[PDB]
Design a protein around this ligand. Structure first.
Ligand SMILES: CC(=O)N[C@@H]1[C@@H](O)[C@H](O)[C@@H](CO)O[C@H]1O
Ligand SMILES: [Cl-]
Ligand SMILES: [Cl-]
Ligand SMILES: [Cl-]
Ligand SMILES: [Mg+2]
Ligand SMILES: [Mg+2]
Length: 734
């Protein structure tokens, strides 16, 4: 142990093909690993590089019968001398290796692409057409082509690496595997976004330092439509991130708010399970969420779509904590033992009870075993399934029994389980399986990194202090620390612990958006409202997950480059129009088809209309599209709207019946305002949850501090169910 502690790694000869092993007579020393396994394999063989590249190596020392691992030692692999030529193109994430060439390759008026993968070819070509505004055509593999993609045999590129060579006779993108081909297309498209007319000659060789480069989204505590998730997928792939963890069930955190204000959280707290399910509780209430859910076909197709983009989707069912969706099915299976946070008992499943593992395993089997309609499991393309198991505040040995059981069930079904690390705060003698188990290291206090590694888990840096975002909250504000993360964050530093970067049990890292301030705390923020902080986090963390331990530029230069490269191809997350030209419609009869794209802020909608009948309790839709509905009359008679995340908002004002009126709706980020005849009629307020807390006194301190009300303007159909006349309509992007 002392040997590894004080090992001395000398400089590597320029061009050496084998790493010299350190020698100490008392013990045995072997390579623990290199952060770039592609450059130094487990046996110490060093692959050639085309530009100087740093590699961190670390060693396992065995003295007597004791083992110990060293710290990281940085070595510098040196390329042979060259004329250097063109500078390295600036990409996010950075291209690892580059040898510049001479001149440019000029793109023609039309572009041809040779691709052995038909699906990749079609996707790449449509992305190219969107980025270039030119016609792109797929030709036969092996035929003359401007851009030729091929699979290479042998080599060190692995599943995700690629070699991109640009010469005067065209572009050649080679990869050991189609995933590397896809990443190479991402690189080429980012290049063409900066200079669409030509690309610098030279050779890039590129591959990731970490194989798991992930994002976790809490889609349980507030809803997200599939369209937003597809934006997320394409933008992750744009920055070469590849692991999307979706929280399928969970519930409002602060049950004590209900308890302390005289209400039962078991009856009142928001809870959601987001997949279509046959499961129904004792009272007959379904497991599947009512406000928004994904069908089994929708989820399987979403997984396959993400796979097209090189992204693995990981679904999480969270038990035995955070399981109010399950205890509502089986209230007899509520945990009855001692616990911290006793007012949150209603979400705790009876971990030691055999009927609990029966229920949970049945739910898992609905998606892990063959589905009769799909002819295959809903999770057939999910190699990893997350079994949750965070923050169970009850008995340690009960918890360990249950966690072992659910992990074992996933493994027996042929899936790789991922779990929230909880075994430092829940130690015990009940064995918890570790072989083949992945683990999010989210809290040092719940699970020490070195303890997790020594117990045999494959670990993912998910540390709450560095990587957690709770939107618009007073804590976990990683969205405010993007510069610090860019300059300082590395995947192998996990809180106050540092693993060697080449440790074989370190898979990479994941950042997380947790929607704590929801239900009766919900300010009405939309998915749109966090897009900037999500994308921004990606454009920083992608660099540190794919690239080296040092940022290639300053944070400010990085964000300049982010702006120059732009959004993912065929992705319009802020719902902007191509040009700021207004839309004017004189309607002839209602309903009237508009077939215009939805419009995000900022905008002004102006209408001259007359509501001619308002039957009580009847909803009247004035504008509609998949993105939402503008309701001239809601069930309570007011003007309002409903978004594609199912959240409903009211302006608190009513249209007059039988009177011409000028309606103006002004959409800004987090605020939509209504004016009637030029007079401020109101600002929209979220309606979904406030009725539960309406009669709480001011001893309750957690009302929404701001009323947010973003509205993506729907413009597919006018007057779907409007009982009135529309004389004039104008939509002005601002
Ligand atoms: C594994 C995990 O993160 N568990 C909880 C999570 O449910 C919560 O929403 C988030 C932010 O407060 O952090 C923890 O308290
Ligand atoms: Cl060196
Ligand atoms: Cl802060
Ligand atoms: Cl949205
Ligand atoms: Mg949208
Ligand atoms: Mg590694």
């Amino acid at each position: 142990k002392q040997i590894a502690d004080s090992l001395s790694i000398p400089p590597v000869k320029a061009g050496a093909k084998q790493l010299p092993m350190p020698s100490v007579s008392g013990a045995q020393i072997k390579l623990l690993g290199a952060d770039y396994e592609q450059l130094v394999n487990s046996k110490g063989k060093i692959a050639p590089v085309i530009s100087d590249t740093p590699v961190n190596v670390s060693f396992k020392v065995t003295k007597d019968g004791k083992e110990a691992v060293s710290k990281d030692y940085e070595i510098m692999l040196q390329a042979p001398q060259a004329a250097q030529g063109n500078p390295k193109p600036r990409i996010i994430p950075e291209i690892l290796q580059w040898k510049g060439g001479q001149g440019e390759y000029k793109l023609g008026n039309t572009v041809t692409i040779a691709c052995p993968d038909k699906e990749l070819g079609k996707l790449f070509a449509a992305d190219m057409e969107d980025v270039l505004g030119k016609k792109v055509k797929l030709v036969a593999p092996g035929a003359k082509a401007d851009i030729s993609l091929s699979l290479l045999k042998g080599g060190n590129l692995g599943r995700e690496g690629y070699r991109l060579q640009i010469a005067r006779d065209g572009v050649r993108l080679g990869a050991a595997a189609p995933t590397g081909l896809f990443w190479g297309t991402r690189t080429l498209l980012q290049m063409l976004r900066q200079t669409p007319g030509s690309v610098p000659c030279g050779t890039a060789v590129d591959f990731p330092r970490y194989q798991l480069r992930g994002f976790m989204l809490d889609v349980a505590r507030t809803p997200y439509p599939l369209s937003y998730l597809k934006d997320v997928i394409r933008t992750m792939a744009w920055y070469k991130m590849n692991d999307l963890h979706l929280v399928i069930n969970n519930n409002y955190i602060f049950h004590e708010h209900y308890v302390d204000n005289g209400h039962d959280p078991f009856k009142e707290s928001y809870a959601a399970f987001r997949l279509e399910s046959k499961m129904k509780g004792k009272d007959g209430t379904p497991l599947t969420a009512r406000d928004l859910f994904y069908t089994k076909k929708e989820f399987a197709d979403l997984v396959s779509y993400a796979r097209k983009y090189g992204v693995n989707i990981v679904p999480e069912f969270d038990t035995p904590g955070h399981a109010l969706s399950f205890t509502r099915l089986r209230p007899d299976l509520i945990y009855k033992g001692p616990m911290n946070h006793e007012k949150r008992r209603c979400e705790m499943l009876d971990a030691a009870n055999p009927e609990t593992i029966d229920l949970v395993s049945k739910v898992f089997d609905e998606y892990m075993l063959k589905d009769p309609k799909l002819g295959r499991p809903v999770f057939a393309d999910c190699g990893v399934v997350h079994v949750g198991a965070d923050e169970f505040y009850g008995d340690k040995e009960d918890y360990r029994h249950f966690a072992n059981a659910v992990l074992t069930h996933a493994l027996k079904r042929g899936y790789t389980p991922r779990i929230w690390g909880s075994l430092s705060a829940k130690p015990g003698k009940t064995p918890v399986v570790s072989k083949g188990v992945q683990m999010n290291l989210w809290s040092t206090g719940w699970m020490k990194a070195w303890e997790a590694v020594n117990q045999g888990y494959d670990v993912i840096n998910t540390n709450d202090g560095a990587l957690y975002i709770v939107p618009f909250a007073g804590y976990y504000r990683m969205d405010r620390n993007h510069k610090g993360l860019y300059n300082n964050w590395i995947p192998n530093r996990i809180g106050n612990e540092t693993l060697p970067s080449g440790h074989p049990q370190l898979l990479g890292g994941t950042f997380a958006v947790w929607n704590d301030e929801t239900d009766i705390m919900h300010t009405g923020y939309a998915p749109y409202d966090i897009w900037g902080i999500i994308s921004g986090s990606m454009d920083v963390l992608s660099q540190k997950l794919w690239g080296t331990a040092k940022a290639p530029d300053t944070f400010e230069q990085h964000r300049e480059l982010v702006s120059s490269i732009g959004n993912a191809p065929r992705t319009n997350p802020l719902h902007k129009w191509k040009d700021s030209q207004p839309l004017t419609v004189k309607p002839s009869s209602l309903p009237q088809k508009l077939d215009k794209p939805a419009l995000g802020p900022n905008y002004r909608l102006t209408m001259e209309l007359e509501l001619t009948a308002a039957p009580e309790g009847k909803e009247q839709v004035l504008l509609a599209a998949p993105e939402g509905e503008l309701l001239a009359v809601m069930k309570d008679g007011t003007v309002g709207f409903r978004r594609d995340d199912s959240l409903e908002f009211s302006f608190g004002a009513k249209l007059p019946v039988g009177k011409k009126v000028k309606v103006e709706i002004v959409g800004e980020p987090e605020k939509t305002s209504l004016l009637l005849d030029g007079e401020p009629a109101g600002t929209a307020v979220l309606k979904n949850f406030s009725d539960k807390s309406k009669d709480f006194s001011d001893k309750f301190k957690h009302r929404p501090k701001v009323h947010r009300s973003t509205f993506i303007l729907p413009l597919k159909e006018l007057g779907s169910s409007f009982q009135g006349k529309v004389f004039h309509m104008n939509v002005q992007p601002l």
